[PDB]
Amino acid sequence: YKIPDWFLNRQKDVKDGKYSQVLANGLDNKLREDLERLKKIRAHRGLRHFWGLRVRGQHTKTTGRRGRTVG
Amino acid sequence: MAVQISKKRKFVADGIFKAELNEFLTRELAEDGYSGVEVRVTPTRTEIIILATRTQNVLGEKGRRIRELTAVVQKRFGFPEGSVELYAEKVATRGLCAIAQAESLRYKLLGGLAVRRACYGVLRFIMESGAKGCEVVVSGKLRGQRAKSMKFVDGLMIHSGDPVNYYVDTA
Amino acid sequence: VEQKKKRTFRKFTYRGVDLDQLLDMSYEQLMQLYSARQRRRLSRGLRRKQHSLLKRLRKAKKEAPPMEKPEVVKTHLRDMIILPEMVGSMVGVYNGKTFNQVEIKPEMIGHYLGEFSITYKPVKHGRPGIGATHS
Amino acid sequence: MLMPKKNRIAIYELLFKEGVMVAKKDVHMPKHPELADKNVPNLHVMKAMQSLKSRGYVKEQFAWRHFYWYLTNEGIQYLRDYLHLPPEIVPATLRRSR
Amino acid sequence: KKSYTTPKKNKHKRKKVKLAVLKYYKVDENGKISRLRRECPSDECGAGVFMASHFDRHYCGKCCLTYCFNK
Amino acid sequence: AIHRIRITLTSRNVKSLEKVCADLIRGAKEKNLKVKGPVRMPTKTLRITTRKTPCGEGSKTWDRFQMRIHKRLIDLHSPSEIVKQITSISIEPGVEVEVTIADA
Amino acid sequence: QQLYWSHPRKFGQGSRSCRVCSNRHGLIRKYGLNMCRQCFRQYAKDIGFIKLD
RNA sequence: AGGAGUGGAGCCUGCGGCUUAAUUUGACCAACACGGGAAACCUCACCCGGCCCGGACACGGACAGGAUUGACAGAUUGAU
RNA sequence: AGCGUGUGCCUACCCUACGCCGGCAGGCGCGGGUAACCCGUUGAACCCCAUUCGUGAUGGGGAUCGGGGAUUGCAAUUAUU
């Protein structure tokens, strides 16, 4: 219906070969795959995911808190 | 103005040349009674008037010193020949020549002498030569290894306002 | 490599094309498969003495017995795109002192070498010291 | 080498003709631009001057990342004998200034 | 700050040891000089510098990045 | 011939500048070359605002320095010979001068 | 020397210095200056600037 | 007398503590977006590997079939 | 609107008009400026006027995070922008 490719959520998903638009319950399923993939290869990404720490370049020294348990 | 620099950068570049020279000379003419310079570009010539108190020691044997110095400057800033020409000049009244008076105190000290007597000798001279007043400080070690200060003061002095720019020189 | 269904078969071909096609492709067709940052490194770079690595990998892969992996090629280079041709080799990657060895999968392609070798201890507390609280 | 025996001469002869040398403090001066090119590969001016200076024959200032070497009477004799040259040369002095 | 610790390797390339050099010309008859290998006529050699007959190689120290056969 | 020649002056000292401008307007008016007076151009500010402390410690203070240059230009129309005559005379202090071939 | 003795530095901090001591970081680039801020002050009076405000 | 805030939330950034091969270092109203210090490399002081001498000068020794410099290919090596 | 700034400087680099291509980031072709001359009569923001939302953790808030495209550099992984 001639909505441009750049205006979609996904362009060449990766390993699926096409432009795609993802909606509600399929979005979560797709999302959980990419997490699993990055622990499959076990890049830096999946390790940070599994440890529950920030993926992107951010300091965690003064961030997140919550917390409790002090000395 | 090719290949030269714009007017903002033009004055800055002059200042850098004025400053480098003024510390270059001071490390090899101090004992000959250096007191500054005064440069003047004129049509097709640079004049660098090497102001010093005693022209005797400046000259050397057959104008040797002036010749060495001119050959240096001619290469360092990369001017072609016939540009830079040094000249000497004797300054009358040395009691207003703070820079030279300071360097006289330097060699009196390095001669091996006490501080009070040396300071006194420099003091009366600059006062006698004609001055409103004058002051000397020597801060550093002597007779122990805690530092101290010894101030020797005579006459009038100012320290505040714009007149400070006219009526005192400091080294 | 001992995986299945990650680059061929039912479930997963690498953006619509199998590994088998990639190996016959030049870098030119390969880079146009969407992975933006990769395309900089090829179009600008074009081999700044990565020569030393890529010959040793193919070489060692060849001479090694069938159904057995080679020894290692080592690197201080943590940067170089993982590629289909590189797969099956075993590479040790310098950290600050230590060469952590890794097997190259066909599922790692596009990534860098340095993501598969860490360079710090994950972390493990803990106990407040004698100087950590206005008290 | 250290340096060639060629590059000794090309500095020491040039020094003898101008009566003074200057250079800048760098260990990455490929040819020493300003003076003499295609016969200095790197340090060499500074590196050869230091050895000369050790044995007298020169005085040396340093100011704002620039050496300044002043040839002396003793050095005139030295350079004359080292390169076995005629007795006519002395550019440091040759006239009494008027 | 701190001073160096302990390695144990401590070798030198070789001192270019003092040997009886030039018998690259061999005495057979008078006044003939019997060459076994060429005294190289490179593109800047004056034919006063020999070329090494390495065995498995052909190497000059002057033409060292060029004019090196493997025979 | 008679060429429209523009003599730009530039200096850092307003007294030293201005009297040398007056001299060049005089030497022109003396020979009745129909010169135009000084056109004083906007004075420009070079600023440097930096810390007074070497190695930060104590209250944060700064210091405004300024240098003010001055530009001004006199337009002449006369033969280029007599121009270079009158230009070179009666200048003693450190003040720059720039002669121009022609102007519209 | 040979093929290793240097690594390209032609932008960033390591490819500029200063002309009165060759010190880096704290320096003034502006107007073609190339002087480190500690030493700039001591040659401030020497033709350059003067305080006025 | 009042005005707007800070202290609460999220983030940025400096400091302590803790960890770590190393998390370089100064500083405790008058330290703490301070060292004009917004660090990819460089910087760089730190940590882990490898190379280089650019040890002047002096005295003695070596030594012209020779004091000494550099390197192709293979092995070795992150490394040509 | 106002203070400024700009390649010809260190070892190498500036400010950009204009035309074209692209949703955007941007690319590409030409031209001026050593500067009261060219960029730039610096046609900036809050402000101002008319639509839409409706007291609702709402479209307030944009943290966190997935996927993709550009530019700088020799290189961007711990995501430079």
UniProtKB/Swiss-Prot annotation, chain B:
<dbReference type="GO" id="GO:0022627">
    <property type="term" value="C:cytosolic small ribosomal subunit"/>
</dbReference>
<feature type="domain" description="KH type-2">
    <location>
        <begin position="21"/>
        <end position="92"/>
    </location>
</feature>
<keyword id="KW-0488">Methylation</keyword>
<dbReference type="GO" id="GO:0051301">
    <property type="term" value="P:cell division"/>
</dbReference>
<dbReference type="GO" id="GO:0005743">
    <property type="term" value="C:mitochondrial inner membrane"/>
</dbReference>
<protein>
    <recommendedName>
        <fullName>Small ribosomal subunit protein uS3</fullName>
        <ecNumber>4.2.99.18</ecNumber>
    </recommendedName>
</protein>
<dbReference type="GO" id="GO:0003677">
    <property type="term" value="F:DNA binding"/>
</dbReference>
<dbReference type="GO" id="GO:0003723">
    <property type="term" value="F:RNA binding"/>
</dbReference>
<dbReference type="GO" id="GO:0006281">
    <property type="term" value="P:DNA repair"/>
</dbReference>
<feature type="modified residue" description="N6-acetyllysine">
    <location>
        <position position="62"/>
    </location>
</feature>
<feature type="modified residue" description="Asymmetric dimethylarginine">
    <location>
        <position position="67"/>
    </location>
</feature>
<comment type="subunit">
    <text>Component of the 40S small ribosomal subunit. Identified in a IGF2BP1-dependent mRNP granule complex containing untranslated mRNAs. Interacts with HNRPD. Interacts with PRMT1; the interaction methylates RPS3. Interacts with SUMO1; the interaction sumoylates RPS3. Interacts with UBC9. Interacts with CDK1; the interaction phosphorylates RPS3. Interacts with PRKCD; the interaction phosphorylates RPS3. Interacts with PKB/AKT; the interaction phosphorylates RPS3.</text>
</comment>
Swiss-Prot record, chain C:
<dbReference type="GO" id="GO:0003723">
    <property type="term" value="F:RNA binding"/>
</dbReference>
<comment type="subunit">
    <text>Component of the small ribosomal subunit.</text>
</comment>
<keyword id="KW-0007">Acetylation</keyword>
<dbReference type="InterPro" id="IPR005713">
    <property type="entry name" value="Ribosomal_uS19_euk/arc"/>
</dbReference>
<dbReference type="GO" id="GO:0097371">
    <property type="term" value="F:MDM2/MDM4 family protein binding"/>
</dbReference>
<dbReference type="InterPro" id="IPR020934">
    <property type="entry name" value="Ribosomal_uS19_CS"/>
</dbReference>
<feature type="cross-link" description="Glycyl lysine isopeptide (Lys-Gly) (interchain with G-Cter in SUMO2)">
    <location>
        <position position="105"/>
    </location>
</feature>
<dbReference type="GO" id="GO:0000056">
    <property type="term" value="P:ribosomal small subunit export from nucleus"/>
</dbReference>
<comment type="function">
    <text>Component of the small ribosomal subunit. The ribosome is a large ribonucleoprotein complex responsible for the synthesis of proteins in the cell.</text>
</comment>
<dbReference type="GO" id="GO:0006364">
    <property type="term" value="P:rRNA processing"/>
</dbReference>
<keyword id="KW-1017">Isopeptide bond</keyword>
<dbReference type="Pfam" id="PF00203">
    <property type="entry name" value="Ribosomal_S19"/>
</dbReference>
From Swiss-Prot, chain E:
<feature type="modified residue" description="N6-acetyllysine">
    <location>
        <position position="32"/>
    </location>
</feature>
<feature type="cross-link" description="Glycyl lysine isopeptide (Lys-Gly) (interchain with G-Cter in ubiquitin)">
    <location>
        <position position="26"/>
    </location>
</feature>
<feature type="cross-link" description="Glycyl lysine isopeptide (Lys-Gly) (interchain with G-Cter in ubiquitin)">
    <location>
        <position position="32"/>
    </location>
</feature>
<comment type="function">
    <text>Component of the 40S subunit of the ribosome. Part of the small subunit (SSU) processome, first precursor of the small eukaryotic ribosomal subunit. During the assembly of the SSU processome in the nucleolus, many ribosome biogenesis factors, an RNA chaperone and ribosomal proteins associate with the nascent pre-rRNA and work in concert to generate RNA folding, modifications, rearrangements and cleavage as well as targeted degradation of pre-ribosomal RNA by the RNA exosome.</text>
</comment>
<comment type="subunit">
    <text>Part of the 40S ribosomal subunit. Part of the small subunit (SSU) processome, composed of more than 70 proteins and the RNA chaperone small nucleolar RNA (snoRNA) U3.</text>
</comment>
<protein>
    <recommendedName>
        <fullName>Small ribosomal subunit protein eS31</fullName>
    </recommendedName>
</protein>
<feature type="modified residue" description="N6-acetyllysine">
    <location>
        <position position="71"/>
    </location>
</feature>
<feature type="region of interest" description="Disordered">
    <location>
        <begin position="1"/>
        <end position="14"/>
    </location>
</feature>
<feature type="zinc finger region" description="C4-type">
    <location>
        <begin position="40"/>
        <end position="63"/>
    </location>
</feature>
<feature type="modified residue" description="N6-acetyllysine">
    <location>
        <position position="23"/>
    </location>
</feature>
UniProtKB/Swiss-Prot annotation, chain G:
<feature type="binding site">
    <location>
        <position position="18"/>
    </location>
    <ligand>
        <name>Zn(2+)</name>
    </ligand>
</feature>
<keyword id="KW-0687">Ribonucleoprotein</keyword>
<feature type="modified residue" description="Phosphoserine">
    <location>
        <position position="6"/>
    </location>
</feature>
<feature type="binding site">
    <location>
        <position position="36"/>
    </location>
    <ligand>
        <name>Zn(2+)</name>
    </ligand>
</feature>
<keyword id="KW-0862">Zinc</keyword>
<feature type="binding site">
    <location>
        <position position="39"/>
    </location>
    <ligand>
        <name>Zn(2+)</name>
    </ligand>
</feature>
<feature type="modified residue" description="Omega-N-methylarginine">
    <location>
        <position position="9"/>
    </location>
</feature>
<feature type="binding site">
    <location>
        <position position="21"/>
    </location>
    <ligand>
        <name>Zn(2+)</name>
    </ligand>
</feature>
<keyword id="KW-0479">Metal-binding</keyword>
<feature type="modified residue" description="N6-acetyllysine">
    <location>
        <position position="45"/>
    </location>
</feature>
<protein>
    <recommendedName>
        <fullName>Small ribosomal subunit protein uS14</fullName>
    </recommendedName>
</protein>
<dbReference type="GO" id="GO:0008270">
    <property type="term" value="F:zinc ion binding"/>
</dbReference>
